[PDB]
Design a protein around this ligand. Structure first.
Ligand SMILES: [Ca+2]
Ligand SMILES: [Ca+2]
Ligand SMILES: [Ca+2]
Ligand SMILES: [Ca+2]
Length: 749
């Protein structure tokens, strides 16, 4: 299979290198016959002789046009004739493209900013990560000596850890009594030892967590300081560093540097992206953090080195575990888009669609529009109206069905042929008009994007049915990832339409999709109300919650299935409404805030879940008790009494102080925490003396931080906690947000 492609220069000529892994053997294929090129639209074919003679200069070397050929391609639906201009080297393109554009007889130029190695994969029809070849993976992490007022990598690397199927090991230059620790004499020997491990293991994938902006940069400065040839590449090369905007990225030639940090940054949404928080959210298992101060203190005193070595080991271990969880999904995404895993894993949603479209455009002989210039880019700060959100009929409801459209936005694009090449196209005999915005779309021929989107949805169905018949559980997982990734890519076409940097950007297309979406969701709602007598409790963009308040659970289900048969016969094209699920009870607080419970007793909450550690146990316990009384018992007046009971126990000081302790970690220098937080205030009082902050809020005057004390110093016989604080700032805010819709103000409890 193909891992990646790049180019080297030989006698001023580009040579493509294709890195492959066939039958467990690494191979490099060379191609010296791929010519870089750009298109040029001319107003007169006679002008081609003037364009051929246009010259530029890179660094003394004269840039010339190698050869030209007239080709017929499609552009905005219409057939067009452009000149394919070939060059000697891909770096000739940025040097001469401006001189060719400025020529009077040149209307415009196209496909002039496509990286050579990526242009090769598309033009040759090559797809990376294709097949069932097994890649060998290796994760690694480093521990460093940090001091407050020092430059980057001024301190040495203390430990280098690595992990794979054989387990996790730590290389260090100090004696540590642990079975997984390998001891060397110096930092130089530790680095050299790590090089030998990578060379002997010969992994296809190197997995890091933030290796793009820390690990490789630290290793580089250290190898320069110690005189070590950091040959990580399979061709004997040192890691290549690139600039990605305001940040960096690192390639390792012959292998795939898989940095988990940008991948997880897009996949899940978390408050922080530390390795500890990420691992705990994905695997649900805790991971202890050992700070730079503790590491430095342990290394200088030689005391708790086992704790440091164990932290180092866990870093490599969890990085390998996370890499095993996210890499197969990103590998299938790379195969789908048609680009290397290195680029795909570092590209955002907008670029992924663009690369997919660029490959398809070449296959369909479709000339790709250019990126917007700075002037046009500033003009594309255009916003528009989004999805429809119904104001919910607040309160507790019984026997609720959730109905939603199968791929609403892609269905609209296909059905109404929404595309920049069909937008206001004159000369057609059939059009579809978008409500409110009024944009017209030609229906005479399939548009470029709707046509590809139709093939994607069709391809996904071919994968779904092959999964049912696939005996092999590993192959079923592979197909499952591809199927899921097609759904993700198909649902990204809409956002791409409103993406200002997009080649196929079209605000008219984007707002037409949302306008049609608002129409279909609203028409379906009034249809179920008027012709089936349902009450629509709440709706958001592509689905709604409905019920018959005076009907049986089986009666609601039956009527819902009958409604589905009815509207699906009336919906045009690919639009389709589906039965998502049935819920025994449901509480709808405000727009975007609600909670439902199924027949199994599983509760789904969207809004103020409050599963955080920076909130007292008393507040979290009461909230759970309230939700249970509402969703399991359907007793609203019981949920109220529970809050009244808790506030009465808090006011009479009958609640144990252990369920009032708040735990908060110090992650930065005390001078940098100028938020006057209670945990920081407690920490500053500790630092004021000679020598996770666990504190309780006591009864007194001043700010919360002025009252707060560590729980170790709290004594029920000498001190009194702030009953008012735990009622008004902890319990009531957490519960009021749920009971709010009933009209139960804070003073009602
Ligand atoms: Ca590449
Ligand atoms: Ca659905
Ligand atoms: Ca088709
Ligand atoms: Ca239909």
């Amino acid at each position: 299979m193909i891992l990646d492609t790049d180019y080297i220069t030989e006698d001023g000529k580009p040579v493509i290198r294709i890195f492959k892994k066939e039958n467990g053997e690494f191979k490099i294929d060379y191609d010296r016959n791929f010519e870089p090129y750009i298109y040029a639209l001319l107003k007169d074919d006679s002008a081609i002789e003037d364009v051929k003679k246009i010259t530029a200069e890179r660094h003394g070397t004269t840039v010339r046009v190698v050869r030209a050929e007239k080709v017929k391609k499609k552009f905005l639906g219409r057939p067009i004739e452009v000149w394919k201009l070939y060059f000697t080297h891909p770096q000739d393109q940025p040097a001469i493209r401006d001189k060719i554009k400025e020529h009077p007889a040149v209307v415009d130029i196209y496909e002039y900013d496509i990286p050579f190695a990526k242009r090769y994969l598309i033009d040759k029809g090559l797809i990376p990560m294709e097949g069932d070849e097994e890649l060998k993976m290796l994760a690694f992490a480093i521990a460093t000596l940090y001091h407050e007022g020092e430059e980057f990598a001024e301190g040495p690397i203390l430990m280098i850890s690595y992990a794979d199927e054989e387990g996790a090991r730590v290389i260090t230059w100090k004696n540590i009594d642990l079975p997984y620790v390998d001891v060397v004499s110096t930092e130089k020997e530790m680095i050299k030892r790590f090089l030998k491990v990578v060379k002997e293991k010969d992994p296809d994938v190197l997995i890091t967590y933030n290796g793009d902006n820390f690990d490789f940069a630290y290793l580089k400065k250290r190898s320069e300081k110690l005189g070590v040839k950091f040959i990580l590449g399979r061709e004997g090369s040192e890691p290549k560093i690139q600039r990605m905007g305001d940040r960096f990225a690192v390639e390792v030639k012959g292998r795939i540097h898989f940095d988990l940090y940008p991948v997880i940054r897009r996949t899940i949404n978390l408050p922080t992206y530390t390795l500890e928080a990420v691992y705990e959210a994905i695997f649900g298992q805790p991971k202890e953090k050992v700070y730079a101060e503790e590491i430095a203190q342990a290394w200088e005193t030689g005391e708790g080195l086992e704790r440091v070595a164990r932290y180092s080991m866990e870093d490599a271990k969890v990085t390998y575990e996370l890499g095993k969880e996210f890499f197969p999904m990103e590998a299938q995404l790379s195969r789908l888009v048609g680009q290397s895993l290195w680029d795909v894993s570092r590209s955002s949603t907008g670029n992924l669609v663009e690369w997919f479209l660029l490959r398809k455009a070449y296959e369909r002989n479709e000339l790709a529009p250019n990126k917007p210039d700075e002037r046009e880019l500033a003009r594309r700060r255009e916003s528009y109206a989004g999805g429809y959100v119904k104001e919910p009929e607040r309160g507790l409801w019984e026997n609720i069905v959730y109905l939603d459209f199968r791929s609403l936005y892609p269905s609209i694009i296909i059905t109404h042929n929404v595309s920049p090449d069909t937008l206001n196209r004159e000369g057609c005999e059939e059009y579809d008009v978008a409500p409110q915005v009024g944009h017209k779309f030609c229906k005479d021929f399939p548009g470029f994007i709707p046509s590809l989107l139709g093939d994607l949805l069709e391809e996904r169905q071919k994968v779904k049915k092959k999964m049912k018949a696939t005996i092999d559980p590993i192959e079923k997982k592979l197909l499952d990832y591809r199927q899921r990734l097609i759904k993700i890519l198909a649902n990204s076409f809409y956002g791409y339409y409103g993406y200002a940097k997009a080649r196929w950007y079209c605000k008219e297309c984007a707002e037409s999709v949302t306008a049609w979406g608002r129409q279909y969701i609203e028409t379906t709602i009034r249809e179920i109300e008027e012709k089936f007598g349902f009450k629509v409790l709440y709706a958001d963009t592509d689905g709604f919650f409905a019920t018959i308040p005076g009907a049986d659970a089986e009666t609601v289900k039956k009527k819902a299935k009958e409604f589905l048969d009815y509207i699906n016969a009336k919906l045009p094209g690919l639009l389709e409404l589906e039965y998502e699920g049935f819920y025994k009870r449901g509480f709808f607080a405000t727009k975007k805030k609600y909670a439902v419970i199924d027949e199994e007793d599983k509760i789904t909450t969207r809004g103020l879940k409050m599963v955080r550690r920076d909130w007292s146990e008393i507040a979290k316990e009461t909230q759970a008790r309230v939700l249970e009384a509402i969703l399991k018992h359907g007793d609203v007046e019981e949920a109220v009494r529970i809050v009244k009971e808790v506030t009465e126990k808090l006011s009479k000081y009958e609640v144990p102080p252990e369920q009032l302790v708040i735990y908060q970690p110090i992650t930065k220098q005390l001078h940098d925490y100028r938020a006057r937080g209670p945990h920081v205030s407690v920490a500053k009082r500790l630092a004021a003396r000679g020598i996770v902050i666990s504190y309780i809020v006591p009864k007194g005057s001043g700010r919360i931080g002025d009252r707060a004390i560590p729980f170790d110093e709290f004594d029920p016989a000498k001190h009194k906690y702030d009953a008012g604080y735990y009622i008004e700032n902890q319990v009531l805010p957490a519960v009021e947000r749920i009971l709010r819709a009933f009209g139960y103000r804070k003073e009602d409890l």
